[PDB]
Amino acid sequence: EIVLTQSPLSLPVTLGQPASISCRSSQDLVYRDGITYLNWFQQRPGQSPRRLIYKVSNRDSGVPDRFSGSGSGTDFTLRISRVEAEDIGVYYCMQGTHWPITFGQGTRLEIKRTVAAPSVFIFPPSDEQLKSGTASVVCLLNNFYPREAKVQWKVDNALQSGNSQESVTEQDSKDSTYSLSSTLTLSKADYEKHKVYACEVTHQGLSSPVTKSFNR
Amino acid sequence: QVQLVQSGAEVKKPGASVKVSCKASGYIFTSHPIHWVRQAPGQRPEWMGWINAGNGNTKYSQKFQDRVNLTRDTSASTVFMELINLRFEDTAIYYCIRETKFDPWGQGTLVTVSSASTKGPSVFPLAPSSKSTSGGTAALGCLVKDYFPEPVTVSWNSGALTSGVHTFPAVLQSSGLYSLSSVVTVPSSSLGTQTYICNVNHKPSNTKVDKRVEPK
């Protein structure tokens, strides 16, 4: 019933720069000695949430000084002095003043770092899959920034469209990079009517496109 | 030490019921009450209920009253969450949380409410070659094709190989089935000396595979 609302819902923040997330309630503060029961959680990639701030401003154990909590009644803030690469994740405000316990939507904190061009690698179909009647060609893009990249598939000089599936990993906590996978999927029949298979990669870190190909 | 371990992911048909486990360890079970919170895709985390692990006394959310049953096994230090009349909106990741300092949250249990047939994945190697090698680094991986439902946990050399590992988020195909790839950057010198195995586990289907990815 108490509806909590987090203002920036996605927040890209440069390494060393400050970050803020807002939470708007409907007056948190129990009758008992005026304690406001607003807590902040951090859900890191491949991890369950971890409480950072409790009781508006109180840091939980092992929480860095850079994390700060503020607010009164209906408007609350989570402020990060200077963002570190390990701060990538979703942040939820949660109230425990009155039951039911309610949460904010979440705020994905992205990191802005310097441009890194990806390493391209191409994988021809496995013979095991070719025995099962289908052929998948995978084009790997590794440890690049920004997330924005373009993979064109060219089968015997014909540009493919639609018959590809891209997939990007969450941002790395260690170095703030991304890795992307592009899978072009053909049938053993279509795959054997052609010879040249190439994935052309275009990115901010590249002065010219990187084409990586193979023949059967 | 102080941890909460949850049961594996379950696919259930609409109308049916799900029972989730949550084993306590590194503290006295009865000493601390448990909380249950689910997160539906692109929705706020929602609080379902609370249970006193000591005396079995419960408190539910109006939405979850007469649909949720919170029971126990104190000798097993396991708390249970039973959700009946499974609707399509109940496809969420379910979390058990210890009350005190809202820590620790359990790893979560993904429950998929669907009419579709469960399908175990087929594991194919992303084998290394000259076409997937840049400056004394080879790329290799597994292609975990056509499975239903989510999730699929992927690891390398029984979780002893972590550096260079990029397990991509799954992608839903035209067939309403999922695909995933897991990649790893290894030195070219280790191919033919070190074995690289990728351990794929799909608990809803009860499929576990160890796939040796060799150069060709």
Numbering used by the authors:
A (entry chain L), B (entry chain H): 1 to 216
Paper text:
NHBA is a lipoprotein that is specific to Neisseria species, and its gene is ubiquitous in all meningococcal group B strains. In this work, we describe the preparation of the complexes between NHBA and Fabs 12E1 and 10C3, the characterization of their high-affinity interactions and the determination of the crystal structures of apo Fab 12E1 and Fab 10C3 at 2.7 and 1.5 Å resolution, respectively.
The binding affinities were also measured for NHBA sequence variants p3 (long variant) and p20 (short variant), showing that Fabs 12E1 and 10C3 recognize all variants tested with high binding affinity, except for NHBAp20, for which no binding by Fab 10C3 was detected.
